[PDB]
């Protein structure tokens, strides 16, 4: 409750979902679309969480039996707390994310793909509806993230890093990204280029998965090891948690079209051109 | 001018022997290996040896130890080919090839006893038949969490008795726990790791690869569609296997062990495949883009820990895959042809790969005189202002000649830049009259200044359009100068490119692709204290040179950065010279092209550029400093190796205006599709049996 | 729950 | 500064010979076989247990007796320290006065023969952080190449540096930590809209900072903007009277001093960072008004807290100091210096003995500074291995709230760090400083 | 319980048995609702 009263951009997240259009359908199709996205993105982010090191997961992930029954109650508590203040549109999202906790057996790609997919499948030209539903969908994704981050129940130590107000930072980042994305491409929109965007989005995701499994089958014989599971000792995991929290907002959501092409016959001072990294510290021994 | 009957002079044999010694000892401590290049039976290795060792002035690499041939000192700074074709009238290529092969034979018998020649095979990797292996399935379960004491993870490098069942059971983990029959002394720990890591939701197999090692030109001369010659070589490696010195030929065997283990339409189609001459099973697994083979080339860079073997002459580019399938399809691709090296007169070949720049190192040592650093005590005696160069005045819109246009996207710019450079090369190639004999020429004076100047233009355009939020955050692009680099490493291998087999555009294309590399190394630099990415037009120079443009020490710092490369002998000096001057000019181009026509974009981007009036003073300081009792050898050497068209603002701005005019004219014709540069293979469906 | 380490459930019940 | 008659009130011939002999005898008596295993732990806390932790002066370096402060002044003045006692380790002020001392000791070369170059301290802070060291080199008349391409902590160690007088080590330390302070400010402001990159043309730094608080590159009063008050809420509450004209210049002395003295103590963290960033953008340009304002801002005193990063323990850092004093109990010179005549040519283990006598003085029942600090560190915070003082927020905040009671705490940390380097018994001060990291 | 809700059948049907069309006329005209946790509370109570 306190980390929510102590912020500035929660009302903006609240006002972003499902405006009563004029007299119109009143976001019924939006209700369906958001529920579908909760349903699928639950499995999506859970299987993303499946292959992780320690120190990056909640204690509600290691216990064997009754693992999908605790998340239900935690999300119900979060929805009660959001309702308690005034935010009746942020509690519905947690109700959805608690209903969709049964099936628990790089991301914006899947978000836009699913949005375009379901929208074109349902409407097979009003252009405002598209914009408000796209805004609601994209903000709902970041809301999923931030809602799941109100956890880890580490007595006091997890919340004392240096930020503790991550909601405003995440809101600013995603607001800039979505403003750019909406202004540049999704304009002059009619019922011809939705199918196009859907085709290229599906092709792009297929390329992403193909290269993912390829580099997964390629990374083993190389002599370039990155640990991916460092330690389970309860003194180095805190270092890594603090490092992730600090350097979280030193990254961006932008993707590049040529990131598997490399320079050849470099010198010793031209190696940095092959790193493809942001905030790259140089380490010596 | 003898006819070169059978032998050479004595001074030439010493050079040839020291060349052979340097070759065999290149990686060090190996003056015995079987890296025997067979010249007569493989003509594409003769030309490799001529390009890399025979026609190159002699220089010894890092080696400080003592190696068998003694000593190198009589042979330094001499090239075998230039002495040969000036001692005799230049004969045919077959006598020279036979002669060099015979002397390599006697050299390889004098050393290493009597072990036989004929190595340097070609490698084709292959791993999967239909699915789930080819090789004896020494699959590895690479799950983590449970090694005894170290960072190591799980391994199950299993024996040949793994042999699986039929379609009876279809689940990998199921068949995994099924075959725990006996497993002497390893059964219980195997079931331990089984019940251990069936959870955590990951189980890996990853069985290894196998390399076919045929000679390329000895078995694929005729019989086009390489797949065909590979399969016909594969069916000749059966036959009452008792062979002698035909190694890497147990592949018939490994597949037998697999065929007797699965089902019995596979023995049928397999044995009808043999001894019918029309049954293909090589079945390419990708789209097979332009650079087919990955030839091996040495370098003074001490090739990194990625080592395969000292027999791999060629290799598949790793974006072209192969898998041994039945009942499949072979899509039509124009890159399956078998193209071999065409023999040439050995003079036109040496002349077709030659540029003056790479002789800089050999002029330096011949002239000596290494410049000395400046030693700040002397710096306070020569600098008299210390004033900090601010100059924040206004721009005069009278005579700027509107050219810029901020409405073209970036991919169109990349396409148009590549096309413009291709047109320039097309123009330079045909020089009147190309009448025989063409003795020897250098790259036309003023070409590198064109690549570098046309690549700085496009990089700065990318940066400027990214600063104004005009590019969608899903199709961004770093280093537009990648698309040029790659595009000129394979420009004489693309169908219908107008430079297909020209044989004269190689050294123009190679020149042009070793620079594009030198532009973004300046424009992106990541300083030493807070390393991150910035998207600016002047921070790269400040990080590379370690000074600010307004400081009174900027020109001295630039010239000292160059002096560190002038010494030791290095062609990087010229390229970095040109790149720095180009960045300085492009700053004052964009500043006044935005200040005069895009006042909003300008009031946003004004703090990412320098000024047209600070750049003028910087350039005047540079040119004044070069011509003063020091740094003078630098200027004479540069003017000896490159053109003096930089230092001329009006000759540099006409090139920018010409490129802008070219864009405007040939933009209504630009709908090409941007030849792909990635290194990840494009897969085909291949829904074959994996159940 | 009651974890933070247990591997099974120590579920209890409350209301706010 | 000294010729307010001396040899009469602040300097005797020195009875500290017997003190040092007895002290060496004592430390060599403790330095024997294994009956006591912690060397720098039993000779710090000699008598126990007395002098209870918390009674009203545990937070201050001295008790309520003026004679004790006078004695500390006398001890520092007897050795050549003098200036480091009346000024703290303030970056700007100590730089100013050390450059004045340097200019007085070599007057004829600088201003009569004019064979060497001379820059003021306000001008050195206006160069980029790689040129500052070169400009310091061509003023202290040392030989070195200009272009480096490496970091300073690796280039410094490539020449003799068996250096001349200590002013040149003091200025090296001050430049190193001013660079650290600048980098920390730039890295910690760093919002999702500001982004404030590296060596970035000081003029453009000021333009970009003013175009972000009030959305226009012209100067504005930052205490009235909406970006300043995003975390908390502010009120104008200024005497809006012109005095004597409109458009206060955002660097005004009255405005800044008023807001400081009225409400700096109830700010967040972003607001203190914004205040120090405004002052720094003033200092990177010339702007004498920022040079004057930086004399009361607290961030220029506590830049010494960035000095302790090694994972040793406090006892080892005391043992290094003890071993550099005993290193100079053999040679004849120098037994003592008389005063702070400012042409006095301070040496190294003069600094060594001064720091020791300053840190380890008692008044008839009262603990020293070392004992109060060690008791706070081990019984209060319960931390050995002193590099965890800056590794966690809560420990660091309590540590910095403790140090802020007295400004002699910063002088204690300064004099203690300068002489507790590892390789201090063999090499100089700046050389050991660069070897340590 | 979730995979038996009125809105669980379709999301388990991606290989189209003519399910998209009736899904879409249920969502366009008819009122399509996600399952409420209030429904699951009574099942929970009963089985406990």
Coordinates of C-alpha atoms in Angstrom, one line a residue, chain D residues 45-54 364-367 371 375:
Chain D
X45 CA 42.1 0.2 23.5
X46 CA 44.7 0.2 26.2
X47 CA 42.6 0.6 29.4
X48 CA 39.2 -1.1 29.7
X49 CA 36.6 -0.8 30.5
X50 CA 36.0 2.9 31.3
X51 CA 34.6 5.9 29.3
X52 CA 31.1 4.6 28.5
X53 CA 30.1 5.0 24.9
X54 CA 27.1 7.3 25.0
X364 CA 43.5 13.2 31.4
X365 CA 40.6 10.8 31.2
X366 CA 39.0 11.3 27.7
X367 CA 39.3 8.9 24.8
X371 CA 39.1 5.2 20.3
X375 CA 34.1 2.0 19.4

